[PDB]
Symmetry: C3
Subunit: 116 residues, 3 copies
């Protein structure tokens, strides 16, 4: 009687819910991907900056020690801080992003096609 | 003797409405975490970009002073690396954070009021 | 007819328990990914702050050496530079949201539907 109408309702609601969860999972995956990419770029930008900063300080302290050695001849050593141990680590969540997209596609096999 | 089926329907509906509730909470927490990650990633991107610009300014000022000192020293008796190309990109996932918060609210329309 | 109804109820319960299972796995993977992001964002933020401090130290030492060279050259015959110590990288705290996700992942077990025969 009404039991059948209730079963149709549950199934429809449940299939609606899953559809929305699928969309939510795929958006989560997207958001975690864009974070992964930008976090890693920013890590690499920092690590490139560090290497080029070490290079610049190496060149500066060389020139300064020359100038001080020339002032010695005309009239103790300049040692700048080492900033090459500083490193930005990268993040690897590609496994979790894949898993989210997998479950998003897998949830199609969780839908209800009731017996007419 | 259709009592078992109606009590099963009531169980399914309660369990479902419970589950969706928990998911709605999980979706909101996700959206929150992505929002805080977006804010901090973007602040840290800017901090790096502000550093890089004021570092190019400083090295400019140094190389100027060094060239003046080397000319002075010749009369009594350098070019260093550019890092302005180093730039931290920013992230835009406010679209995906929206879509999570939308689906969290929209799941209220997936809930079940059983008929009787 | 009441056979079809019962078999439909079984189907609904098995699909539902299926779906929830997959979602639990998805919530755990989300929590993982936010955890690894939080750790790496925070390590990067500290690396930048440690770089800023050591850089301000190096520029202090350079401008000191340059001012001495300029005073020597004036005796044979302060001009300083930009402050960066102000620059600071914030840290992120989402351990509350990660905890909640794993909480909800476990709590969904109480939403499942049991062997009724
Ligand atoms: Zn969809
Ligand atoms: Zn000497
Ligand atoms: Zn934001
Ligand atoms: Zn030159």
């Amino acid at each position: 009687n009404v039991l059948y109408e209730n079963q149709k309702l549950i199934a429809n609601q449940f299939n609606s819910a899953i559809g929305k969860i699928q969309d939510s999972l795929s958006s989560t995956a997207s958001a975690l991907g864009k974070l992964q990419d930008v976090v890693n770029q920013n890590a690499q930008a920092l690590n490139t900056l560090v290497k080029q900063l070490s290079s610049n300080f190496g060149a500066i302290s060389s020139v300064l020690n020359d100038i001080l050695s020339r002032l010695d001849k005309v009239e103790p050593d300049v040692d700048l801080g080492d900033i090459s141990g500083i490193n930005a680590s990268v993040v690897n969540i590609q496994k979790e992003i894949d898993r989210l997209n997998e479950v998003a596609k897998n949830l199609n096999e969780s839908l209800i096609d009731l017996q007419e």
